[PDB]
Amino acid sequence: DPDLNSASQLAQGKVYWNIRFTDVPPAENPNFRVEVTDQWLTEVLD
């Protein structure tokens, strides 16, 4: 960390490291959105 590793914090033997990360959340609600469309209905012409 740049702002927390000051010249006075390092002089007391304090040096700071930042570890940011993201967990793997459990997919407890997998949503599926089904739609019936007529976009590829003209695909049965050739």
Place this chain on the structure above:
Amino acid sequence: DPDLNSASQLAQGKVYWNIRFTDVPPAENPNFRVEVTDQWLTEVLD
């Protein structure tokens, strides 16, 4: 000599010169002023 070479003394026919020189002094007391600071502590970042 600036303060002695006058116009009234030029008629006397006696002009004045000065030979000054600064002699090399022996270093009989070589002091060292060593200090510990915290100026370059932020240099330890990358």
